[PDB]
């Protein structure tokens, strides 16, 4: 029963059991009924914690691997790979949900959901790109950019520049350029213009959107400061 699964997802969150949380929301999505804004948030929060823990772990191991006896380096590499394979499975799960249900069921004028989900698609291809090498890397980098690009065009044409979802897209897209494409001028240009287009009308946002957008703007600023130094 659908509501039990969502209830479970909420319980898992409170218990900070994010693997459970994501598995519940995965099952909910596969019912092919649309997610409400709260359900969409549960999905997004769950998988971000699941993949986020692995990204964090992967970076620790990767760094150790770099700063370090065949059998010692062999264990480090294998452990890194173990973490990589998990990260890849999680991303594949999310990307399959997005392609087969979430993006698919957005109607022509559900712009916010389209931008939300295409962004998400951009994000999890970006997480794959973080650990990928070679031709597999080219593919996930290309897929990431395409999802970001399509979400960007929708957001520019059909959403206010102050909208948290549009701002959050610009934030992550600019991060893609900086970290994945190593294109610091492109990254800064996207970040700055997004910031600039929103900052004048910030006060026109409602209470909850103003909170969300302010935070994202601060991160845009923080990234610009960091990147231009």
């Amino acid at each position: 029963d659908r509501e039990q699964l969502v209830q479970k997802a909420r319980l898992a969150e409170q218990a900070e059991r994010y693997d459970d949380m994501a598995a519940a929301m995965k099952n909910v999505t596969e019912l092919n009924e649309p997610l409400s804004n709260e359900e969409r948030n549960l999905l997004s929060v769950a998988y971000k914690n699941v993949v986020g823990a692995r990204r964090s772990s992967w970076r620790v191991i990767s760094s150790i691997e770099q700063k370090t006896n065949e059998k010692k380096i062999e264990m480090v590499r294998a452990y890194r790979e173990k973490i990589e394979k998990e990260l890849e499975a999680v991303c594949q799960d999310v990307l399959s949900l997005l392609d087969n249900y979430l993006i698919k069921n957005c109607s022509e004028t559900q712009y916010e959901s389209k931008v939300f989900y295409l962004k998400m698609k951009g994000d999890y291809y970006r997480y794959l790109a973080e650990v990928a090498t070679g031709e597999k890397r080219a593919t996930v980098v290309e897929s990431s950019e395409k999802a970001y690009s399509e979400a960007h065009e929708i957001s520019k044409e059909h959403m206010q520049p102050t909208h948290p979802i549009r701002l959050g897209l610009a934030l992550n897209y600019s991060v893609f350029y900086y970290e994945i494409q190593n294109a610091p001028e492109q990254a800064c240009h996207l970040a700055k213009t997004a910031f600039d287009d929103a900052i004048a009308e910030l006060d026109t946002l409602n209470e909850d959107s103003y909170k969300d957008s302010t935070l994202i703007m601060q991160l845009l600023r923080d990234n610009l400061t960091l990147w231009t130094s």
């Binding site: 948030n41 929060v45 971000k48 994000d123 979802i165 934030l171 991060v175 909850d208 959107s209």
Partner: peptide, 11 residues
């Protein structure tokens, strides 16, 4: 040091 990305949730 690394770039900050978007929070997973909305209000």
């Amino acid at each position: 040091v690394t770039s900050s990305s978007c929070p997973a949730d909305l209000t």
